[PDB]
Amino acid sequence: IESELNSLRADYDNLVLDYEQLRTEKEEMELKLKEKNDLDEFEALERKTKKD
Amino acid sequence: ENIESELNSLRADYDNLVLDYEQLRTEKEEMELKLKEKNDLDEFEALERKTKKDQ
Amino acid sequence: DHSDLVAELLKELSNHNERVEERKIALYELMKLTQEESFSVWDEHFKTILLLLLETLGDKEPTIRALALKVLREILRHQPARFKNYAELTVMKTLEAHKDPHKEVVRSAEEAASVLATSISPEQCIKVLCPIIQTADYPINLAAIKMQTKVIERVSKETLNLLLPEIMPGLIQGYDNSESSVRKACVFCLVAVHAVIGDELKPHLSQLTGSKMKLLNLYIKRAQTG
Amino acid sequence: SLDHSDLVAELLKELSNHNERVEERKIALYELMKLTQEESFSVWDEHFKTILLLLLETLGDKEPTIRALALKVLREILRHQPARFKNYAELTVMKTLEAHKDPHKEVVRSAEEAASVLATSISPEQCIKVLCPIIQTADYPINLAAIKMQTKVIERVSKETLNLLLPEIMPGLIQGYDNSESSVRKACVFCLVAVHAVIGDELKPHLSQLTGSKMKLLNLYIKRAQTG
């Protein structure tokens, strides 16, 4: 079990580092998506005023 | 015995990290599809402008 | 006895706008029955479940609405042959969910409309989508055009020609739409129509301007290089 | 060499190798950028025009990495030597605005940064008078870039000065509100929000040519800007 413990800790430590790479990739797409949100909100407000 | 507890806690924490990563991987893929659709749409709008200029 | 459990589900899920957590359990219970070989349930209780699941789409709770669309997606792909007599009702209700203010409902509704393209009979789905496309407002017309693109891929080239006099009006009309996403969705639908019938599409596109013809041929060329 | 006068001649000699010697010109541009950070009195008193004109031609290079780098160097000269662009406002604005329509994201991104510093480096009343004819006559996306700049510049003129410039500002803003592109219309709405924020209700007679739905949409973003 002690040898098994040493190998499992490595996989957990490797997954933590890999997880950071995904969080940094997802947070960048949010920064890119944030640009779209203010524009698409404007276009939706235009349609609502035109309907009225 | 204390080694057994250390393995027992780490195995549970690893499964929680696996679940969090799987949930995040599905979350990141939605942002990819949304970015790709917007990018192909902005390309469409740009391709539209070129046809009007040339016509 | 599946029926006694269904009575409890039909009793709870009829409590609209109240008992939020108890109906969430009931809706989740209905979804498990969908995965199971509970075909005895559906021979006698399909219509009751569909109408109660469609009425639930008008719930004040966005998580209840988004959940009913998740269960409905499963009933669509587990019992697709049962929607013959309810195509228009299921299509028009699923398209209305596309304009919900909450992302969780529209996102879950886009998924139900995705399974709906392959579950509803393709010949029947096109004839339902045509009047919707030609008369609906954004984003329902946009959602209906995306659906027809998926549905057109499933009809033969001989069958598609018969539906062209009815398909093309909304496609040429949506090409003039003020929204660029609608114009783009129409091009990709015409790319799918061109991919099937080839040069036979040419007489139908006579009413397109030169700049739209150029843009369309541009995306036709792009589709072939793949 | 390191001698300031000798170094500039070598920089002007190397950067004159247009379309060729990419790595040798990148080093010269990075070296030119360092001289900008130094507040070197002797370099800029005699060689600003020569460096600017050679740096502006560099924006037309076939290499996208050379273009994007000159836009970063230009950004540095803009905020380190802003008083020197007095006689080159139209040239610097129109060249930076043309960089906004490059196909490569790295070039437009570096140009959007140069156009951001440009709003506070060019004289603000002078910057408006350069942007107005551009806004009223340019095509996408240059008109969009010029309106965004005018929004940044309008915030820097007094209420008395802005009213005098309104007869020249408002034509392009009403025209861009009818523009086919939604991004241009929003930039015009946000520009009118900046104009309303300065002169308040005095803007009301200028909006007489607006439709009811555009007036309603505009009032919505004025309220949204004030609420937070």
UniProtKB/Swiss-Prot annotation, chain A:
Q: Where in the cell is it found?
A: Chromosome, Centromere, Kinetochore; Cytoplasm, Cytoskeleton, Spindle; Chromosome, Centromere
Q: How is it modified after translation?
A: The C-terminal inhibitory domain is phosphorylated. Phosphorylation relieves autoinhibition of the kinetochore motor. Sumoylated with SUMO2 and SUMO3. The sumoylation mediates the association to the kinetochore.
- Disease linkage in the record? Microcephaly 13, primary, autosomal recessive: A form of microcephaly, a disease defined as a head circumference more than 3 standard deviations below the age-related mean. Brain weight is markedly reduced and the cerebral cortex is disproportionately small.
Q: What does this protein do?
A: Microtubule plus-end-directed kinetochore motor which plays an important role in chromosome congression, microtubule-kinetochore conjugation and spindle assembly checkpoint activation. Drives chromosome congression (alignment of chromosomes at the spindle equator resulting in the formation of the metaphase plate) by mediating the lateral sliding of polar chromosomes along spindle microtubules towards the spindle equator and by aiding the establishment and maintenance of connections between kinetochores and spindle microtubules.
- Give the similarity note: Belongs to the TRAFAC class myosin-kinesin ATPase superfamily. Kinesin family.
Would you tell me the protein name for this molecule? Answer: Centromere-associated protein E
What range of the intact protein is shown? Answer: 496 to 547 of 2701
Swiss-Prot record, chain B:
What does the entry's PTM section describe? The C-terminal inhibitory domain is phosphorylated. Phosphorylation relieves autoinhibition of the kinetochore motor.
Subcellular localization(s) per the UniProt record = Chromosome, Centromere, Kinetochore; Cytoplasm, Cytoskeleton, Spindle; Chromosome, Centromere
Name the source's superkingdom: Eukaryota
**Entry's family note:** Belongs to the TRAFAC class myosin-kinesin ATPase superfamily. Kinesin family.
Record function comment = Microtubule plus-end-directed kinetochore motor which plays an important role in chromosome congression, microtubule-kinetochore conjugation and spindle assembly checkpoint activation. Drives chromosome congression (alignment of chromosomes at the spindle equator resulting in the formation of the metaphase plate) by mediating the lateral sliding of polar chromosomes along spindle microtubules towards the spindle equator and by aiding the establishment and maintenance of connections between kinetochores and spindle microtubules.
Q: So which disease is it linked with?
A: Microcephaly 13, primary, autosomal recessive: A form of microcephaly, a disease defined as a head circumference more than 3 standard deviations below the age-related mean. Brain weight is markedly reduced and the cerebral cortex is disproportionately small.
Name of this protein:
Centromere-associated protein E
**Which organism does this record belong to?**
Homo sapiens
Curated annotation (Swiss-Prot), chain C:
How is this protein organized at the quaternary level?
Answer: Interacts with microtubules. Interacts with MAPRE1; probably required for targeting to the growing microtubule plus ends. Interacts with CLIP2, ERC1, MAPRE3, PHLDB2 and RSN. The interaction with ERC1 may be mediated by PHLDB2. Interacts with GCC2; recruits CLASP2 to Golgi membranes. Interacts with MACF1. Interacts with mtcl2 and MTCL1.
Q: Identify the stretch(es) annotated as Required for cortical localization.
A: 1-226
Post-translational modifications: Phosphorylated by GSK3B. Phosphorylation reduces MAPRE1 binding. Phosphorylation by GSK3B may negatively regulate binding to microtubule lattices in lamella.
Q: What is the lineage of its organism?
A: Eukaryota, Metazoa, Chordata, Craniata, Vertebrata
Protein function: Microtubule plus-end tracking protein that promotes the stabilization of dynamic microtubules. Involved in the nucleation of noncentrosomal microtubules originating from the trans-Golgi network (TGN). Required for the polarization of the cytoplasmic microtubule arrays in migrating cells towards the leading edge of the cell. May act at the cell cortex to enhance the frequency of rescue of depolymerizing microtubules by attaching their plus-ends to cortical platforms composed of ERC1 and PHLDB2.
What does the entry's domain section say?
A: The two SXIP sequence motifs mediate interaction with MAPRE1; this is necessary for targeting to growing microtubule plus ends.
The name this protein goes by in its record: CLIP-associating protein 2
Q: Which family does it belong to?
A: Belongs to the CLASP family.
Q: Which organism is it from?
A: Homo sapiens
From Swiss-Prot, chain D:
> Where are HEAT repeat segments found?
2-39, 46-83, 164-201
On tissue specificity, the annotation reads: Brain-specific.
| Annotated region (Required for cortical localization), positions in chain | 1-228
Consult the record and explain the modifications the protein receives after translation: Phosphorylated by GSK3B. Phosphorylation reduces MAPRE1 binding. Phosphorylation by GSK3B may negatively regulate binding to microtubule lattices in lamella.
Q: Where in the cell is it found?
A: Cytoplasm, Cytoskeleton; Cytoplasm, Cytoskeleton, Microtubule organizing center, Centrosome; Chromosome, Centromere, Kinetochore; Cytoplasm, Cytoskeleton, Spindle
Q: What is known of its domains?
A: The two SXIP sequence motifs mediate interaction with MAPRE1; this is necessary for targeting to growing microtubule plus ends.
Q: What does this protein do?
A: Microtubule plus-end tracking protein that promotes the stabilization of dynamic microtubules. Involved in the nucleation of noncentrosomal microtubules originating from the trans-Golgi network (TGN). Required for the polarization of the cytoplasmic microtubule arrays in migrating cells towards the leading edge of the cell. May act at the cell cortex to enhance the frequency of rescue of depolymerizing microtubules by attaching their plus-ends to cortical platforms composed of ERC1 and PHLDB2.
Family classification = Belongs to the CLASP family.
Know the name of this protein?
A: CLIP-associating protein 2
Q: Which organism is it from?
A: Homo sapiens
Question: Entire protein: which part is shown?
Answer: 1053 to 1280 of 1294
